[PDB]
Symmetry: D2
Subunit: 297 residues, 4 copies
């Protein structure tokens, strides 16, 4: 078996988990953006694999250096603009690059407040969902930017059921019109090539849409007839309220909370003590796109 008998379907390399903090000072007031960056390249040749020839390979160490240099020279107005700047640098600098993908997540530092007063230079880690983005470009193709939020755990204690599902000989699940709906969410949305707007302002607005659609109104909530329907309500709320979102993917990993039978312990448990099942767990996932955007492709 030689190079003649085999096809190269895919080659990809890069640098993962480049961690750094970009500090910005407006007099005594300090601002931080701490990020984790992964940048992957596909080269137009595979001589490093096929021939043991490294002439075209950009060291992963150089990828790291370029990420740090760009953060120093340009600052980080948004992780999206930083991801764009990194992909642009690789495409305009190195003709051996066929494809570049940059992934960035924010370390979720918040400014400390003492009795409602913002601290000039003190922060606390508050992971209430991780902000990320992804930029990718093929040689002479569109630079496509996605933003998202992952590890976002939302729970409501009622206005959730699952009824009228397909029944067969291996279906023991009872019908329920009241249950805890507890979800870990992964949400990712494409802007396509739109790059004009306030990335931070749009991300916050999408996040608000996710929480509002999940919960329903604060005085009464809204019935969810399935995890899948709640995923749909979230996607349709984002697309209704945020025109810059062209495509939205939502993944919901759920935890069932079991009302433990306490009859043998001599008491009745009227939805008072509930035990979460972490494993195994259900997931559902949907990607919706605007007809207009998909046609214009």
């Amino acid at each position: 078996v030689t190079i003649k008998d085999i096809e190269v379907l895919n080659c990809e390399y890069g640098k993962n988990t480049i961690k750094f903090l970009r500090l910005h000072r407006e007099g005594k007031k300090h601002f931080v953006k701490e990020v984790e960056v992964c940048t992957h390249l596909r080269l137009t040749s595979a001589h490093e694999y096929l021939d043991g020839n490294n002439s075209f390979v950009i060291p992963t160490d150089t990828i790291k250096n370029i990420v740090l240099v760009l953060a120093k020279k340009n600052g980080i107005s948004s992780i999206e603009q930083f991801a764009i700047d990194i992909c642009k640098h690789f495409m305009t600098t190195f003709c051996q690059v066929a494809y570049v993908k940059t992934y960035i997540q924010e370390v979720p530092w918040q400014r400390q407040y003492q009795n409602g007063v913002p601290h000039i230079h003190s922060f606390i880690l508050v992971p209430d969902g991780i902000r990320f983005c992804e930029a990718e470009q093929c040689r002479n193709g569109p630079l496509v930017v996605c933003a998202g939020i992952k590890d976002l755990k939302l729970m409501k204690t009622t206005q959730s059921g699952f009824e009228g599902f397909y029944r067969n000989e291996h279906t023991t699940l009872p019908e329920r019109n009241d249950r805890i709906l507890c979800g870990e969410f992964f949400c990712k949305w494409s802007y396509g090539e739109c790059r004009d707007f306030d990335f931070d302002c749009i991300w916050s607005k999408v996040r608000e849409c996710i929480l509002e659609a999940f919960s329903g109104p604060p005085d009464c909530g809204e019935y969810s007839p399935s995890y899948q329907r709640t995923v749909n309500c979230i996607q349709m709320c984002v697309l209704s309220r945020v025109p810059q979102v062209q495509v939205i993917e939502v993944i919901l990993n759920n935890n069932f909370y079991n009302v433990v039978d306490m009859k043998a312990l001599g008491c009745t448990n009227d939805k008072e003590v509930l035990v979460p099942v972490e494993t195994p767990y259900g997931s559902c996932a949907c990607t919706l796109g605007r007809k207009k955007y998909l046609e214009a492709q």
Copy 2:
């Protein structure tokens, strides 16, 4: 080097025997009409028995199954609710001590799952929540037979960072000391804080926990308009402990552990830039720690 082909129970002392149930996870739901309230917890309850027959003789006559420990925790949560994790820990220890004469010692550890109520435009949602881990609340109750019931509270996985008003100077130098003196650096810490109330059990446990948490953040940061210089991680640990002890009389003993991350100002001279504290790279490993336990002299003497 030995006179016997084996050891027997005659040759050995039992220094410690302990068993129990770990990570009992449940949510206690309370409804006031349409408004829902949640407390989700992880409970560990350990016992020492007055005998070790289950170990030494293969005789289980006195062993309370770990399964029974779980059942008792769930029954108490259903019957009593959870006003505070501390009161729940107390109720569990009290149940074991008053119910089973074979129990020499009981320890209950509880941590809260950090659920917060969702808000829409300042309006609290009746039944919707979001996980917000800004430091994990825990407590610990323990009692020996005929001893005091002692309650501790704490906060762990609390990661705080300030970007200035931190240095480390005038330290001991020797042939293996290459560390430069610094009067400006990032102070980034993961905190473990635990404090003893001793036998004090009268007060609002939630109100006191919040007050200690505020003391930790305020002492770490200094005032919001200017901050406060830290000459070492150790000194910051001291400022935190002395702030809590000054402001919260119910705290008798306080342990603080600070695991730090150095943020290195990357040398970029070879890349053709000067980096004036603009790009900083954290060292996660290896990491420094310091730990201190302070107590009130009067409380430690009276014991």
Copy 3:
């Protein structure tokens, strides 16, 4: 914005991390296979999402029940055969299923040995690389089976360099002809529709090829001029020695081991003390396929 303005690009649901142990007894001798199973479905409609109508949804709870029933009735001769049996069950049973994918990994239990004698019923967890497989089928499509090994950490202390790479204004890396080569490997290979052979025997043979190709001969080793070349040597060794492998993906996550500069501490470190960099880390990935197999997929 309404259902009229929007296209459903993709819908997928399932049950993740179904953990169970299948126990088999031959008199006093016990055999165990403990696995983690994930089974995902795509349905032919999306009424559960679009209309709030669950008529076609097979509960994830039923997916779990089916996995456990199949393990009880059929046993687990191999995780590959089990993955196949699960996908076949979903396709032949439920007309609303457009697509099924089953992922399985083995919990790496080994039998305990006392002085070379196998214990009848005692085991130890030894994670020296996790065995996994994947089966998938579209309605009216082929049932495709992949096998793999992940979390396999291999290290050699010499016969590794990286020289003659592209240099630019942001390149500070020195050329090195001696360094530690330390890799965490993810390897996945396709059999396509081939289902006749001993799955366990072929998996073991691929594993041997990976270790031998990584190391070179035991008396001298073999120079690696890059992580990428070592990935290639592994793939070409597997394809040369195992005809059932049609396509092979290898991902190598590396750790650099730095020779600590100790000049300021008053001693010289001649590749004696080395500190691993866990983050950031380099990765490279390649998928090779047999021309013959890829053509015959027109």
Copy 4:
């Protein structure tokens, strides 16, 4: 509330997770020891805490430097000897140190074999329980060494029950004479001041005692009437066979494997499919010491 009203019970600082590999070459043949080291100090004063005065503080950075220098100068024959060398360095060098504790664990690298031949410079990670040790010394006190094994997951599929336990109104557990006994073990033992023997030889012997006592003989095994009794059998086997062990702590975190009721799915499960409960989980812990060693601590 002032410094006068407050007592310092305890002050401790140090450097955690110092990761490095010590490489030794005998011609072509390479030998590796990769370790994670934590070294903690208590100082004789607390001026750094109480007064903001760092004059006596040995930087944690200097603790790291000392660990790397000692590994370079002395090599690592055993992690126990390395732990001893580090504690001895701090105690003989720095009069501000009242107490030093060094914890070390081995990265479980094994030499690769190709057709029965040990590879000169190639290794695979095989975590079959993590080897660790601990050395500590007070000023004017003994240097005490502990060794151990953690993350050791052992399982037997029979010869395990739990019967004749205390029954009360909240006890629903059935009596069982057959069940899976699955345990994650933490084992730590003290040698006290004994330092004349081969550390590697004794650690291997203790490990063999743990596996043999857990499993019983390979042709029949041995009935366990509780997790606690199995912990006892392990401790008494170590103490019987290894005179250098003065004190032994064993912690057993168990997982119940439930025989899943499949009656409603139309089949009977005769201990064929078992589902582990990871949470909540039971634990038991015991520390045994020799009477003779505890007396001789007058």
